[PDB]
Amino acid sequence: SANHLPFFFGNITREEAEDYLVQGGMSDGLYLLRQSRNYLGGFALSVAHGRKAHHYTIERELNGTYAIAGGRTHASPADLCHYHSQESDGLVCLLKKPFNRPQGVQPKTGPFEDLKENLIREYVKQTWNLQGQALEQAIISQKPQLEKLIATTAHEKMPWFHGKISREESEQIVLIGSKTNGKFLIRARDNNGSYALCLLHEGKVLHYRIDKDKTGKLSIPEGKKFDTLWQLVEHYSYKADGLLRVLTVPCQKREALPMDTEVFESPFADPEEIRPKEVYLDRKLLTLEDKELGSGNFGTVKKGYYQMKKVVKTVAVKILKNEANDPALKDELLAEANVMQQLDNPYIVRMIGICEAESWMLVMEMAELGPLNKYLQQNRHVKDKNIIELVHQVSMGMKYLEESNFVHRDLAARNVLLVTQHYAKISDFGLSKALRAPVKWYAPECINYYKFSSKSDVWSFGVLMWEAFSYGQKPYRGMKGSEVTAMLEKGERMGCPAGCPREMYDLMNLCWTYDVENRPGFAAVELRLRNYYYDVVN
Ligand SMILES: Nc1ncnc2c1ncn2[C@@H]1O[C@H](COP(=O)(O)OP(=O)(O)NP(=O)(O)O)[C@@H](O)[C@H]1O
Numbered sequence: 370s371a372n373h374l375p376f377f378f379g380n381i382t383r384e385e386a387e388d389y390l391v392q393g394g395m396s397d398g399l400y401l402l403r404q405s406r407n408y409l410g411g412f413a414l415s416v417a418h419g420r421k422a423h424h425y426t427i428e429r430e431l432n433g434t435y436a437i438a439g440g441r442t443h444a445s446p447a448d449l450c451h452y453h454s455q456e457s458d459g460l461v462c463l464l465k466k467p468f469n470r471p472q473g474v475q476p477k478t479g480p481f482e483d484l485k486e487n488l489i490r491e492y493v494k495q496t497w498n499l500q501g502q503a504l505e506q507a508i509i510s511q512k513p514q515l516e517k518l519i520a521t522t523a524h525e526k527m528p529w530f531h532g533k534i535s536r537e538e539s540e541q542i543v544l545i546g547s548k549t550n551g552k553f554l555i556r557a558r559d560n561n562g563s564y565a566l567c568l569l570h571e572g573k574v575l576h577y578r579i580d581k582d583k584t585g586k587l588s589i590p591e592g593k594k595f596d597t598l599w600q601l602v603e604h605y606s607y608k609a610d611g612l613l614r615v616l617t618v619p620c621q622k623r624e625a626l627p628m629d630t631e632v633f634e635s636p637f638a639d640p641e642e643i644r645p646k647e648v649y650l651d652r653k654l655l656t657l658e659d660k661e662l663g664s665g666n667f668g669t670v671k672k673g674y675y676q677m678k679k680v681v682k683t684v685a686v687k688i689l690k691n692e693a694n695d696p697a698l699k700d701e702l703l704a705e706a707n708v709m710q711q712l713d714n715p716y717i718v719r720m721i722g723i724c725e726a727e728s729w730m731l732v733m734e735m736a737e738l739g740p741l742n743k744y745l746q747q748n749r750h751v752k753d754k755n756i757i758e759l760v761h762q763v764s765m766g767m768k769y770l771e772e773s774n775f776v777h778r779d780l781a782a783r784n785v786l787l788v789t790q791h792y793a794k795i796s797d798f799g800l801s802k803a804l805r806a807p808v809k810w811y812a813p814e815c816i817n818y819y820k821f822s823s824k825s826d827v828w829s830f831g832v833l834m835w836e837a838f839s840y841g842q843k844p845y846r847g848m849k850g851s852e853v854t855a856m857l858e859k860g861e862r863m864g865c866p867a868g869c870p871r872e873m874y875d876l877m878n879l880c881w882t883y884d885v886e887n888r889p890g891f892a893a894v895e896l897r898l899r900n901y902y903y904d905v906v907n
């Protein structure tokens with residue numbers, strides 16, 4: 370807890386924190402503390418310097434201590450702030466003057482805020498019937514979109530809404546049990562937007578009227594206007610305004626979201642569907658379209674249809690080149706295909722199985738919008754926040770591959786395929802290894818020692834992030850491979866793309882760590898990306 374700190378604001382947005390620093394005059398070293406927007410019990414420090422706001426995630430360590438970017442440990446966020454008032458230790462400047470919560474503003478950390486994580490979890494379970502890893506993977510990518518969604522749900526299902534209870538009933542229900550100050554409920558006074566807010570204050574029930582104006586807005590007499598009871602409760606849980614005190618505990622009574630697609634879950638998630646007993650698929654159940662979707666170094670891709678029990682599944686089929694028919698390649702191709710088929714995550718193009726027919730055929734999930742680099746080059750109106758969402762999903766798919774001890778070897782924007790504008794999937798994982806086989810995407814140890822690992826996939830991910838933020842431009846423009854190797858040895862790197870956030874360019878640079886040992890793994894990359902994504906996207 371940090372509620373005792375007068376400059377601690379709780380769970381506010383990054384923009385609200387910047388608005389407060391502007392309110393405080395934007396002087397160099399002016400700062401405030403807030404809660405990390407990730408449900409991980411961390412904090413965020415917002416500092417003014419050179420007329421810009423600088424934000425840093427404070428992570429809670431396993432032993433209950435706190436640190437920024439794997440840096441030094443601090444006993445508490447107050448102690449971290451004190452240390453940073455004398456030594457920068459990586460921050461833009463020293464912490465000079467705190468911006469205290471204005472008069473009448475309490476930390477945004479009450480029971481209303483606490484309910485959010487479980488509400489989003491319950492919303493995914495109910496809306497999409499997701500469980501286990503599919504459920505956790507939905508939440509991690511879509512937390513900001515899901516928080517916006519739960520705010521629009523009907524007030525009647527909220528724990529603080531008691532419906533058509535009378536004034537006398539509300540009085541008795543607010544008084545039963547422990548007399549927690551701020552204990553409250555909302556009841557309907559009629560069926561035309563008239564409500565009452567009953568609040569416990571030093572053992573007495575206060576009955577406030579909530580009325581709907583001609584413009585459809587809700588308010589208490591002379592109070593701030595709100596479009597919903599959700600917004601009204603959120604506000605009053607940290608700014609009492611016209612109330613005697615804040616609300617606390619409720620009284621006891623092409624643009625689709627990833628989960629809205631048929632490829633979010635595995636085609637075999639339905640227990641009545643027949644999962645193939647091995648890597649092989651029945652060619653008799655597969656139909657290909659005449660026209661190709663494209664081609665590459667390993668084969669041609671066509672749209673296809675795979676006959677299953679309940680439905681016909683639209684698939685993408687990669688028909689491998691004649692070179693893959695060589696008997697010398699067979700065992701490793703089949704061995705890699707088996708391992709590809711084991712992989713199951715929403716952020717990868719799942720490899721359904723293989724057909725040994727006229728040619729070797731890899732049957733995959735369909736990602737109809739095609740590759741990320743070509744999509745961004747054709748759709749330059751795609752916002753920076755949408756690119757962050759897409760690259761974060763790639764870091765999730767890669768975290769899963771790393772956990773599965775699977776090295777991609779060709780991670781690049783051409784190998785990130787879009788199901789929707791808000792749903793990316795990693796494709797062609799392990800294909801270059803399967804076919805016994807791009808230098809601009811290779812880590813220095815790959816070109817020098819042929820050492821491919823999850824760490825060299827991290828390096829590739831940095832180049833991919835650069836491609837994404839550059840709207841599908843080519844990396845190291847016009848340079849030969851030898852010039853790229855020499856430039857990297859000098860410690861030089863590609864520049865920050867136009868409009869690319871500074872935290873995203875710092876993450877690229879971290880992926881481009883020369884030394885393999887010091888380069889982060891995908892767990893660290895995904896978490897750093899997730900923290901930034903959750904702080905900027907509201
Ligand atoms: N699962 C898929 N779903 C939909 N389209 C796909 C899928 N896989 C590949 N494609 C399409 O086929 C095109 C070529 O794929 P591919 O043969 O993997 O070449 P590439 O990745 O561009 N270059 P390379 O590294 O040489 O293979 C892509 O640009 C996509 O348009």
Ligand SMILES: [Mg+2]
Pocket residue numbers: 665783784796797
């Ligand atoms: Mg490819």
